[PDB]
């Protein structure tokens, strides 16, 4: 009888046990070592925290105290690495980056 | 070779990553909310990244004729899928998490 679940052991907020169960039930491999869910969960938490902080900064530079899909779209499309990672992904209700061609501008 | 009442029958009542995403948001932005649509977008993102990394790790294990998906396969999949600085920081976070996990 003890305590201190795997997420607390790894210093993670994401669920290591649920990730382990998804890996074991996902038909990915015959066996899953017990470092794979921890590594995975850490990587997923890092990506989630990165996009969440970028979207929070985007909301903070709008006088808004709540993240909407527009802020997530602005955070993703303004980072080339995140844009390349999600280049074939459509964010619902996220709009598009404001961009007008230089030729279209009048003078 | 024995069932013993068959406890395996668990019902997934539309389980998602919303609680953990909320915890991460409170960690990074203590005073900031998130709409339901944005949380659904983040849930879809987490599921997509999980599927991508798991599929890449499975293909890596199959190519090398290994039957086990270890943290090495996850690290190689992260290096393959994520771009440069993203992959480097993700590898650092995964290595730190695995080292903390296998130290107690």
């Amino acid at each position, epitope marked *: 009888a003890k305590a201190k679940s795997r997420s607390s052991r790894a210093g993670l907020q994401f669920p290591v046990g649920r990730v382990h169960r998804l890996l074991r039930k996902g038909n990915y491999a015959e066996r899953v070592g017990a470092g794979a869910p921890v590594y995975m969960a850490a990587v997923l938490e890092y990506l989630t925290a*990165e996009i969440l*902080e*970028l979207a929070g900064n985007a909301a903070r530079d709008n006088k808004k105290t709540r993240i909407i899909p527009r802020h997530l779209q602005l955070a993703i499309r303004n*980072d080339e690495e995140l844009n390349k990672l999600l280049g074939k992904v459509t964010i619902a209700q996220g709009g598009v980056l404001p961009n007008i061609q230089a030729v279209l501008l009048p003078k | 070779a024995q069932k013993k009442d068959g406890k395996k029958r668990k019902r997934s009542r539309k389980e998602s990553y919303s609680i953990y995403v909320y915890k991460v948001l409170k960690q990074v932005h203590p005073d900031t909310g998130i709409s339901s649509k944005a949380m659904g977008i983040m849930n879809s993102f987490v599921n997509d990244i999980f599927e991508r990394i798991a599929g890449e790790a499975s293909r890596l294990a199959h190519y090398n004729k290994r039957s086990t998906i270890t943290s090495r396969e996850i690290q190689t999949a992260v290096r393959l899928l994520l771009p440069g*600085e993203l992959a480097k*920081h993700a590898v*650092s976070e995964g290595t730190k998490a695995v080292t903390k996990y296998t130290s107690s």
Partner: single-chain antibody, 226 residues
């Protein structure tokens, strides 16, 4: 591999304008922002601003708004910094550094720096001057004004040399840095520890926070051994 080439020393007169390049090579030019900082003996290092060449997105320090303008040329992979109306207090060493778009990353590679001579969160480093033998234990502290969540970096700078990254994210070793240096702390209290002092550990050590919009450097600590 990764290099940030700059120009020579500029001699200028008051009221003139100066343009300096930051020609970069060895990496994907659009994937890393170029930051500009200025160094004077009076108040040490100061963060001027940065430009992201991927979308040409700039952001300047509040006290440097208007005085400094940043531009990018993707075809030649170069960054230009322009200073207009150079007053008396502009003769300094201007450095351009690379920094990834990731919030955890810091200024990893610095240019040689151009010496131009004209004819909020506060960072506190406790030990201004320091002495040590060739094998002793040493430590410096960079207690911050507000709360920064581990977005602290430690740099070492030889005299008349560009600063070199030692620690990023307050605990991580920079690329190529030995394990002798050790970063620790978080929140508002941080520390950089040196295991044993070699002859190469004679330099000025600075701490930089990039948690809030205006990046602020520390006062700096001068460490000469024996």
């Amino acid at each position: 591999e990764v290099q940030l080439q700059q120009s020579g020393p500029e001699l200028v007169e008051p009221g003139t304008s100066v343009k300096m390049p930051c020609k970069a090579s060895g990496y994907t030019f659009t994937s890393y922002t170029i930051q500009w900082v200025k160094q004077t003996p009076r108040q040490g290092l100061e963060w001027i601003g940065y430009i992201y060449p991927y979308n040409a997105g700039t952001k300047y320090n509040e006290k440097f708004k208007g005085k400094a303008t940043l531009t990018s040329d993707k075809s030649s992979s170069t960054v230009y910094m322009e200073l207009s109306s150079l007053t008396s207090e502009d003769s300094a060493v201007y450095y351009c550094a690379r920094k990834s778009s990731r919030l955890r990353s810091t200024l990893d590679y610095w240019g040689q720096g151009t010496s131009v001579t004209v004819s909020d969160i506060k960072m506190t480093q406790s030990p201004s001057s320091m002495h040590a033998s060739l094998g002793e234990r040493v430590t410096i502290t960079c207690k911050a004004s507000q709360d920064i969540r581990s977005y602290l970096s430690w740099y070492q700078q030889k005299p008349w040399k560009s600063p070199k990254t030692l620690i990023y994210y307050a605990t991580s070793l920079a690329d190529g840095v030995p394990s002798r240096f050790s970063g620790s702390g978080s929140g508002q209290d941080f520390s950089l520890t040196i295991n044993n002092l070699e002859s190469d550990d004679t330099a000025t050590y600075y701490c930089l926070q990039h948690g809030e919009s205006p990046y602020t450097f520390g006062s700096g600590t001068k460490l000469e051994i024996k």
